[PDB]
Design a protein around this nucleic acid. Structure first.
Ligand SMILES: Cc1cn([C@H]2C[C@H](O)[C@@H](COP(=O)(O)OP(=O)(O)C(Cl)(Cl)P(=O)(O)O)O2)c(=O)[nH]c1=O
Ligand SMILES: [Cl-]
Ligand SMILES: [Cl-]
Ligand SMILES: [Mg+2]
Ligand code: NA
Ligand code: NA
Ligand code: NA
Length: 326
DNA sequence: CCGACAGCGCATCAGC
DNA sequence: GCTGATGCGC
DNA sequence: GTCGG
């Protein structure tokens, strides 16, 4: 909020490059610049001052100078006025419509919420459910609701098998006062990097959450990742809660710490951390941290017994979840 | 200058 | 059907 | 769009 004007401008530029230009590197550059400026503990007085931060170069410095002098950016003012860019940007707000489908729909005259509704047969399943809950999926989730959702998910998982461990990650684990969705890390001792003693480990949990009418819709589902929709139950005569996005990730139990580091994020934090790992000669994914040889080929998984072990390998002081909101 | 930019599950489609 | 590329979203 | 080498 200290530099909220600038970071909003950069986020809108990032969205334009991703959604309209399909220029993924410009998208990530703008997001990195917005992240470093959001973290900067001073009210930026000039582009030159912002250029000192890593990820802000000459181009963004000049945009910041325009924004500070005038309160706006002509480039963005023209983008807002362009019907084609505005239409593509809007459609990507539906879950499952990305930049390519958005431009395909616009090209064939499908430009608004009603166009989508009257053309539901042009949508795949994910897009159909994203359209159905368009308004709901724009709402934030109060942390008090996240706590009730956690209670349901952990207890229903416990009812399936007491040896499951479900961990709510995402912004919730970083202590945020509100979240965009619910991310659940799941483990069971039957599923390790060495063996899967039991099938349908994820299915059984999903099935149970559907049975109690917590999970209401499916966006995608495989043996280790479920992405879908859920809803808190409401009380008598009470308006319903919005439907909410939920993601469940089943990770081999012996890879919990890499999985919980990954699912806790933020996404930019993970990108920064994984980039730094590469510079230190390691690669990090949600399963393992491995060394890189002189060929750059990933070696064998290093032993990991805590989140901090992962930080230790890349020579970073440990950062608590609440300081990973980048 | 310029190569690299984090890493991967699931859905869908083309080609065979 | 399988395989590989692409889209999308974490 | 930015940056390390
Ligand atoms: C999108 C994305 C995610 N994650 C990891 C890190 C992410 O933290 C984790 C969950 O993804 P989610 O999109 O739900 O991100 P949240 O942090 O929970 C959030 Cl603040 Cl955007 P909100 O959901 O509360 O609105 O997955 C990544 O590693 N890379 C990615 O590109
Ligand atoms: Cl690009
Ligand atoms: Cl791995
Ligand atoms: Mg989340
Ligand atoms: Na800089
Ligand atoms: Na979308
Ligand atoms: Na998520």
């Amino acid at each position: 909020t200290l530099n909220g004007g600038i970071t909003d401008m950069l986020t809108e530029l990032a969205n334009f490059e991703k959604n309209v230009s399909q220029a993924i590197h410009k998208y990530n550059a703008y997001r990195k610049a917005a992240s470093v400026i959001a973290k900067y503990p001073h009210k930026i007085k000039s582009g030159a001052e912002a250029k000192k931060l890593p990820g802000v170069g000459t181009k963004i410095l000049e945009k910041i100078d325009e924004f500070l002098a005038t309160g706006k950016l002509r480039k963005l003012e023209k983008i807002r006025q362009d019907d084609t860019s505005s239409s593509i940007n809007f459609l990507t707000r539906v879950s499952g419509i990305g930049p390519s489908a958005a431009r395909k729909f616009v090209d064939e005259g499908i430009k608004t919420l009603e166009d989508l509704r009257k053309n539901e047969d042009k949508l795949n399943h994910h897009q159909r459910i994203g359209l159905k809950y368009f308004g709901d999926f724009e709402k934030r989730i109060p942390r008090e609701e996240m706590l009730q959702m956690q209670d349901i998910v952990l207890n229903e998982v416990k009812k399936v098998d007491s040896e499951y461990i479900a961990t709510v990650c995402g912004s919730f684990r970083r202590g945020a006062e509100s979240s965009g969705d619910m991310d659940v890390l799941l483990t069971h001792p039957s599923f390790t990097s060495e063996s899967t003693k039991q099938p349908k480990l994820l299915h059984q949990v999903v099935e149970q959450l559907q049975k109690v009418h917590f999970i209401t819709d499916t966006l995608s589902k495989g043996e280790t990742k479920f992405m879908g929709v859920c809803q808190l139950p409401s009380k008598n005569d009470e308006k319903e809660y919005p439907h909410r996005r939920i993601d469940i990730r089943l990770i081999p139990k012996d890879q919990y710490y890499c999985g919980v580091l990954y699912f806790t994020g933020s996404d930019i934090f993970n990108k920064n951390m994984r980039a730094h790992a590469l510079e230190k000669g390691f690669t990090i994914n949600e399963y393992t941290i491995r060394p890189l040889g002189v060929t750059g080929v990933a070696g064998e998984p290093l032993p990991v017994d805590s989140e901090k072990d992962i930080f230790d390998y890349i020579q970073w002081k440990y950062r608590e979840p609440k300081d990973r909101s980048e």
